[PDB]
Paper text:
[name] is the antitoxin component of the parDE2 toxin–antitoxin module from [name] and consists of an ordered DNA-binding domain followed by an intrinsically disordered ParE-neutralizing domain. Like the more intensively studied CcdB, ParE poisons gyrase by stabilizing the so-called cleavable complex between gyrase and DNA. This leads to double-strand breaks, activation of the SOS response and ultimately, if the ParE toxin is not counteracted by the [name], cell death. In analogy to [name] from plasmid RK2 and [name] from M. tuberculosis, we predicted VcParD2 to be a DNA-binding protein that represses the parDE2 operon.
The VcParD2 sample formed crystals that diffracted to 3.1 Å resolution only after three months. The asymmetric unit contained four dimers of the N-terminal domain of VcParD2 and the corresponding models encompass residues Lys3–Arg51. The N-terminal two and C-terminal 32 residues are not visible in the electron-density map. Dimer formation buries about 1240 Å2 of mainly hydrophobic surface and creates the hydrophobic core of the protein. In the crystal, the VcParD2N dimers are found in a circular arrangement. This results in a torus consisting of eight VcParD22 dimers. The interface formed by adjacent VcParD22 dimers buries roughly 600 Å2. This interface is highly hydrophilic [PISA P(Δi G) value of 0.91] and is dominated by hydrogen bonds and salt bridges, and as such deviates from typical stable oligomerization interfaces. In contrast to SaCopG, VcParD2 does not associate into a helical structure, but forms a closed circle. The dimer–dimer association of VcParD2 is nevertheless very similar to that of SaCopG bound to DNA, suggesting that crystal packing may also reflect associations occurring on the DNA here.
Numbering used by the authors:
A (entry chain D), B (entry chain C), C (entry chain F), D (entry chain E), E (entry chain H), F (entry chain G), ...: 3 to 51
Write the structure that this text describes.
Amino acid sequence: KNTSITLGEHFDGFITSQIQSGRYGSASEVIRSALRLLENQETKLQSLR
Amino acid sequence: KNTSITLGEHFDGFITSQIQSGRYGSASEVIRSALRLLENQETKLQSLR
Amino acid sequence: KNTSITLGEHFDGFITSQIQSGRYGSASEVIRSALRLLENQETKLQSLR
Amino acid sequence: KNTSITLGEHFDGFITSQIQSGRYGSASEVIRSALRLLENQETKLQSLR
Amino acid sequence: KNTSITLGEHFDGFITSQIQSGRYGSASEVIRSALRLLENQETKLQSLR
Amino acid sequence: KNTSITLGEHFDGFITSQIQSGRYGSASEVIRSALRLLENQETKLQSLR
Amino acid sequence: KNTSITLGEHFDGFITSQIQSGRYGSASEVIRSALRLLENQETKLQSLR
Amino acid sequence: KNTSITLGEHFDGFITSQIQSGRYGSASEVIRSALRLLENQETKLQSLR
Amino acid sequence: KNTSITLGEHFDGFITSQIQSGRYGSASEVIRSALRLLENQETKLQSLR
Amino acid sequence: KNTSITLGEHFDGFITSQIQSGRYGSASEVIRSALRLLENQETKLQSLR
Amino acid sequence: KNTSITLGEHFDGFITSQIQSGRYGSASEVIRSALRLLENQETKLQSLR
Amino acid sequence: KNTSITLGEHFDGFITSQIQSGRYGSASEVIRSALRLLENQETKLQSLR
Amino acid sequence: KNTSITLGEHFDGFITSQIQSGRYGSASEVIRSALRLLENQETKLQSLR
Amino acid sequence: KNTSITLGEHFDGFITSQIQSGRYGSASEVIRSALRLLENQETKLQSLR
Amino acid sequence: KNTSITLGEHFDGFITSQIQSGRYGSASEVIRSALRLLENQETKLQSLR
Amino acid sequence: KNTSITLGEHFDGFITSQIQSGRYGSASEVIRSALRLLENQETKLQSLR
């Protein structure tokens, strides 16, 4: 719980702009959806080997 | 940069397991790679419309 | 049954524009089709792991 | 904003299960992600016809 | 058999367009082909889960 | 409006069964999703020529 | 319309198998679907040459 | 044997035209090739599930 | 018209076994379908160069 | 061995044109290559069903 | 006309075995079909760049 | 090894042009690569049946 | 731990520009992501064999 | 020139495994191949926007 | 003309075994075919961009 | 060790172009990458028979 992360200005602006578009709610939503993408990709990877 | 966000225990464990495999260095690396994946998806999407 | 959702203005506009095409009937139809897509994605995901 | 939807017991259970997996936060998060999936499908579709 | 279904004006126009091209004979035919597609999808789905 | 169509005694059972799983609403909803699938298959196949 | 065609016993059995499954209604229906496939092939062909 | 089938006034012209190009023999030949195409599409699509 | 061909025993057996399946009618049908396949391959080839 | 086939003028012209391109030697060569193409198609097909 | 080629024993045996199978006539047939394959592959390559 | 075969002017020119591009050394190299392509096709084919 | 590598000036500038794009943090992060891509390509190669 | 970086024990073992296989000469070779792959990815990315 | 290259023992044995397989003539032929594969991979990369 | 081979002026220019781009270090690197590609091809080949 409560993890400290050091992101660049690029991804800060990216998260803010994703919030502005109305497609995402909070920054937690954006990061959790991106991590869902990454976890699904990794699960697809190890499904082979 | 230097922000604290409370993620679920599932995603905390996922990030830790990804770090323990040796592929990723820090949790910042994992979150940056996830954001890169999401940004590339969005770039492939909005390039059409 | 009888759930209250807080959707953004962007997603309300998306649902309305989907209804305007005539392909979908109501907002419930659009949300049900979206949940069907997500459930199919999950059923294809967890089939591996 | 403020939408009252009467989802079936199957979709209520699916939303609750996606919450319990730790991948999704709230029910609104699941519904927004499913709507994002449908929106991306349609954005890939209407780019052709 | 012999069921009353309120299809949207868009889908009514689509069924008429498919009929008047000569490729399909009746509205029952176009609906049966669409249901064949959907049943193939669902049978490929529930075979996994 | 409210078109009467003589479907086979097999697609009737399939529509009802798809309703029973809690994934679809009415028979009109299943028929509409199937017509959407046929329209999307059209748009994807007629994309070449 | 109303043409006499000598189809082989294999294709007669195939048309019957497609009919008695409930997915197709008449032999005209199965032949029309097959001709749709063949016409799509030829239209994609002669569009090139 | 020698089945009588009521095809539309459009597939009639298509069959004749395909005969006129010197690529097919009789109407039975065109119908047989189309049925072969449908059977092969079946064998290729039902290969997954 | 009225051409004499010197086919090997292997190809005579292939044509006969194709006729035995019921998908094709005569040896002329098999040879015509083979020439159609080769002509389609060529028409797709020379479309580039 | 020794097969008398009455090919249409279209296929006679196609065989002669394939001979004139310098890619094929005789008409029997073109017919054997087309039969090889059909045999490979069927060998790829029957491996599934 | 009349070109001298130095092939290994591997491809000599390969050409002879392709003749034995009845799929090819002479060694010229085998080599010309292989060169047709190579020319089609090269034409597909330079179709892009 | 050290065999003379009369190929068509088309294939002679094709081989010469392939040698002039600098990719292939001799005509033996070109014919060996073509035979490798055909042998790999045959290996992928007969591996099934 | 601690490995010395002499990369080209092209890759030096590329790594520095990837750091400057905000998508990557340090040079080690670019190297780790590239090695992840390489390992995933290897794994996808081993998917078939 | 002569830069020192510390990759994880995972990536150290990975580079050593790639060298002991004989495919890659130095660690510089493995890193340059990975950087080529990642540069291909990023260049395909930036071509859209 | 005349270039000196120090390849690994793995690739030395691989080239000698490819020569021994009868598929390739000399070491120069293996090297030229591998460089052809590499150039074709590059060209296929430039197909999109 | 220290083997000398003569590749064509085409392949000489190719290796030089790959070096001047900064992607590949030596000519040994380019040749080793090409040999890796060809070894992947041949290993995927021999896995069948």
